[PDB]
Write a protein that binds this ligand. Structure first.
Ligand SMILES: [Mg+2]
Ligand SMILES: [Mg+2]
Ligand SMILES: [Mg+2]
Length: 92
RNA sequence: GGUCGGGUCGAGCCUAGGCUCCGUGAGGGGGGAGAAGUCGUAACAAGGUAGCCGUAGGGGAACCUACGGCUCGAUCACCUCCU
């Protein structure tokens, strides 16, 4: 239901680097080493290959970012019906 | 007081050599935190091959093997020496 705002955009989880760090491919072609904020790190489990909202850092907004929201399967289908996400983006 | 000659002292300046300090720096090396991406299970009980010290060789990694040593080693049988 929430949508990206400003620098926020859609991303796909690619690899888990441990220590609360993730690898996420964005919808423009940049692989970013993102950090999981503690507020949502203690509530929601996240696996490899999920759609999330990536907010770039105010400094060096090219390789580092944060993950601020994750969607569910029903939300993924709803976005697919709306026309905001495509099969190519899911499959990379 | 000017000019020339002689003797002596002399800050500074140039060249060469030798030590030493500060700023960068391609590349290499371990150390400390973090939390988990990964492969195993070396230690604590006889931890499932008792553990550890010295020296030497080998192995993805904890580690393994040989010679001499210590008890900071468990259980059973026998023997020895004491109170
Ligand atoms: Mg063991
Ligand atoms: Mg052992
Ligand atoms: Mg060997």
């Amino acid at each position: 239901v929430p949508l990206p705002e400003g620098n926020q955009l859609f991303g796909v989880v690619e690899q888990a680097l441990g220590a609360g760090w993730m690898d996420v491919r964005c919808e423009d072609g940049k692989i970013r080493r993102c950090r999981i904020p503690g507020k949502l790190r203690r509530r929601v489990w996240i696996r490899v290959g999920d759609l999330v909202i990536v907010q770039p850092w105010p400094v060096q907004s090219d390789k580092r970012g944060d993950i601020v929201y994750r969607y569910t399967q029903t939300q993924v289908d709803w976005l697919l019906r709306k026309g905001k996400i495509t099969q190519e983006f899911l499959t990379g």
